[PDB]
């Protein structure tokens, strides 16, 4: 009953731009049981997958999703199995709730050896992003067994407090994104560097105003922090964690290259078809999807797809499709999982609105073509962060997308899970 990573040469998928409803999403949430009295909101979602195992995390709130009171933090893992239906489904095996739900933030997950490793920020001054200057820089790593042993002592659950942190010219450093990858015995977590704004080194003339009246050369630099006046700037990157660097191994921050540079955002690094891809959410003026093959890791350089079809809703300054350098900080995280490297086709769930968080559409796409798609709900269904991961089941490509979704007036708000087999035929 084993799901496998997306590797080698899977079955054929339709490579034709079509309008036929070949895509037939399935709702499989149920196998991830979730309770909550009315007026409960479940958010800050995380889903990760590797080798037929998953990590998961959410923050359960009472009140609004934005400001509501943190009731509990779930951090769990389990396996991705065939539910007998020849359909992929998740199955929890190990969960862990942190003592104080208010202290943990921005968790990130990577799998290695019968273990998922969840690296979080620890903060008593709130979200480390929103109160940058007052955060300890304090990190923490949990390590859950994907197949819990009937009690061993440190196996099933284990914690490390993270002593040393090679962080270079960056003041503070933290995990910023759903999941990363392993390289043998090295873990790479999506992450972010906090660099004092004054020490930010930028030739304002590298800003792409060249077809943009109203955009001023200063815009790119200013849009590298949450406010123009902000104390730090954010630089996306990876946090390296060597498991063989002793009992107490160091984390090392690796900044992303200054190619097509946005303000540090929640990002993903993942293996598809024998080579890592890297996604970075678009949280300012560069609103077309930013992902593409990883050329090299330890000097971190990403070959950004020159996509012209996929975007996200912003607000007024930088809405969906905006390409001109404006000074802003807004957006959502709808990632995209590469499924065909020969033809560069990727699958994701995107929000078909300009300035609004609604209408989740599971879309399969190429750089300048959307081949096929599938509305997950209704036109005015509310949706936010979406997390897509792809794998194989009997050499057939499946995708599981976690989607922040509800339509106005349901009692408990919470993310749902969609399994979406990728079709071989282009027809019926």
């Amino acid at each position: 009953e084993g799901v496998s990573n997306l590797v080698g040469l899977p079955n054929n998928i339709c490579l034709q731009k079509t309008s036929n409803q070949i895509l037939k999403p399935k709702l499989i949430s149920y196998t991830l049981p979730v309770v909550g009295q009315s007026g409960t909101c479940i958010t800050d979602p995380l889903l990760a997958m590797d080798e037929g195992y998953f990590a998961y995390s959410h923050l359960e709130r009472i009140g609004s999703c934005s400001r509501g009171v943190s009731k509990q933090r779930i951090i769990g893992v389990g396996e991705v199995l065939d539910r007998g239906d020849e359909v992929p489904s998740l199955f929890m095996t190990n969960v862990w709730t942190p003592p104080n739900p208010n202290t943990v933030y921005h968790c990130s997950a990577v799998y290695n050896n019968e273990f998922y490793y969840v690296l979080c920020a620890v903060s008593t001054v709130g979200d480390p992003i929103l109160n940058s200057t007052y955060w300890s820089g304090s990190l923490m790593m949990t390590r859950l067994a994907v197949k819990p042993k009937s009690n061993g002592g440190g196996y099933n659950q284990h914690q490390l407090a993270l002593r040393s942190i090679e962080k270079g010219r960056y003041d503070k450093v933290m995990p910023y994104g759903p999941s990363g990858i392993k390289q043998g015995d090295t873990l790479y977590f999506p992450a972010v560097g906090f660099l004092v704004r004054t020490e930010f080194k930028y030739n304002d003339s590298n800003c792409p105003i060249t077809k943009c009246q109203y955009s001023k050369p200063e815009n790119c630099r200013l849009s590298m922090g949450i406010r123009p006046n902000s104390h730090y700037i954010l630089r996306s990157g990876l946090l390296k964690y060597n498991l063989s660097d002793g009992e107490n191994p160091k984390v090392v921050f690796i900044e992303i290259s200054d190619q097509r540079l946005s303000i540090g955002s929640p990002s993903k690094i993942y293996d598809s078809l024998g080579q890592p891809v890297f996604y970075q959410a678009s949280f300012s003026w560069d609103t077309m999807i930013k992902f593409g093959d990883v050329l090299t890791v330890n000097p971190l350089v990403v070959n950004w797809r020159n996509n012209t079809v996929i975007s996200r809703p912003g607000q007024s300054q930088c809405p969906r499709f905006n390409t001109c350098p404006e000074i802003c900080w807004e957006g959502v995280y709808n990632d995209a999982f590469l499924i065909d490297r020969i033809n560069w086709i990727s699958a994701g769930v995107f929000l078909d609105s300009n300035q609004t968080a609604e209408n989740p559409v599971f879309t399969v796409f190429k750089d300048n073509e959307i081949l096929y798609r599938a509305q997950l709900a209704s036109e005015d269904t509310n949706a936010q962060k979406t997390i897509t991961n792809c794998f194989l089941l009997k050499n057939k490509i499946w995708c599981i997308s976690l989607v922040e979704i509800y339509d106005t007036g349901d009692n408990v708000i919470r993310p749902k899970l969609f399994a979406v087999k990728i079709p071989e035929q282009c027809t019926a």
């Binding site: 909101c41 934005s66 609604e358 106005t408």
Partner: protein, 141 residues
Amino acid sequence: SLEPVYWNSANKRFQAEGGYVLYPQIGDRLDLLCPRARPPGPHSSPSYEFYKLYLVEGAQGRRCEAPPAPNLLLTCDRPDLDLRFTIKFQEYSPNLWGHEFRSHHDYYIIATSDGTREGLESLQGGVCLTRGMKVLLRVGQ
């Protein structure tokens, strides 16, 4: 459903009787428009009027004043273009600050500049006082 707000002196709904009150339902959308007015079509104003639109507490709406680091909805710098912003009274959003609407709380949208490229970054009652340029939001229970 909800009527779009054309944010310029030509609007007229600003200095009317009730004084521009809206009763948004949970789920509704609201579009704020700063229309062209350079190649002038309808809804546009005598000249271009420079505004920043802030979403505000209500007590702050009264005082015609917006806090430091305000909730800036819409900046109106572009006389050439039509500019618009859209809110859906809902829990999810492309907004990264994590504000929220409360129950039985009045909020305001206001403009506190004087309508000029120079006095644009002003946070205390400008057109808010001068042209009664503030809208009241009373959102469904």
